[PDB]
């Protein structure tokens, strides 16, 4: 018997817009657990959007978070509860971040690393013992929100896309000297790198 409000199927939808099997019971149980997890995710997101101060404030109407990470784009993070343009990367990152926040309590680190202690943040314990600095190796010691991190990631993605498109146009429009780009294999959620080269058409060797 599924608990009330966990019925149907729910999936969080994150979009960027340039405008404005086996056992039956298993399916029901997994769908209800996913609905509960998405509800917790969106509750944390809305609470961080409302009660935390940040630049370019955001709007939450009923179940949709509309933000302007850049002055010329819109990020929409809306929970979709069916009750019977999607970037799956951002949804996966939201799920993994919520699961990491959940594992923080069951974290093996915070569990009395030595013996007969106080069971808390063994890294911070070693930093306090080894006399760590005010901000350096302390300051906030991890104190951010799901919304902040997600917005940073979205901004990085947009910037990457922008640079890519710009170089592509440069490659298609300007053809006289040359243009080249070799994107790196490993990237990050807040960083990336390319290798631009401007050679000539025939003299590749000397024109380096």
């Amino acid at each position: 018997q599924i608990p009330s409000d966990l019925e149907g199927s729910a999936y969080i939808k994150v979009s960027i817009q340039k405008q404005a099997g086996s056992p039956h019971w298993q399916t029901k149980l997994e769908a209800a657990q996913n609905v509960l997890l998405c509800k917790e995710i969106f509750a944390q997101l809305s609470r961080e959007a409302v009660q935390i101060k940040s630049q370019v404030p955001h709007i939450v109407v009923k179940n949709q978070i509309i933000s302007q990470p850049f002055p010329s784009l819109q990020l929409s993070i809306s929970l979709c509860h069916s009750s019977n343009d999607h970037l799956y990367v951002l949804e996966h990152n939201l799920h993994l971040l919520i699961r990491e926040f959940h594992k923080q309590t069951l974290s093996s680190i915070m569990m009395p690393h030595p013996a007969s202690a106080p069971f808390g943040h063994k890294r911070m314990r070693l930093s306090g013992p080894q006399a760590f600095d005010k901000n350096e190796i302390n300051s906030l010691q991890s104190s951010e929100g799901l919304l902040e991190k997600i917005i940073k990631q979205a901004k990085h993605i947009f910037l990457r896309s922008r640079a890519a498109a710009t170089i592509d146009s440069l490659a298609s429009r300007i053809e006289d000297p040359q243009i080249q780009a070799h994107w790196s294999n490993i990237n990050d959620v807040y960083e990336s790198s390319v290798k631009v080269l401007i050679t000539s058409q025939g003299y590749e060797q000397i024109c380096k």
């Binding site: 409302v50 630049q55 370019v56 404030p57 709007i59 002055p71 010329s72």
Partner: protein
């Protein structure tokens, strides 16, 4: 409110003044401005 500082300018480099729908205070967003001057200006604006 996107108010420009200088007449010849693009989308950026203009004061974007937003209002928090939940709180009502004025929040200014300049691209390259330091955060201390930013919060000082925010307080001076929210005062009057």
């Amino acid at each position: 409110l996107v108010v420009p500082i200088l007449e010849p300018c693009g989308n950026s480099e203009c004061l974007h003044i937003f209002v928090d729908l939940h709180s009502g205070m004025f929040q200014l967003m300049l691209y390259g401005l330091d955060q201390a001057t930013l919060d000082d200006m925010e307080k001076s604006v929210n005062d009057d």
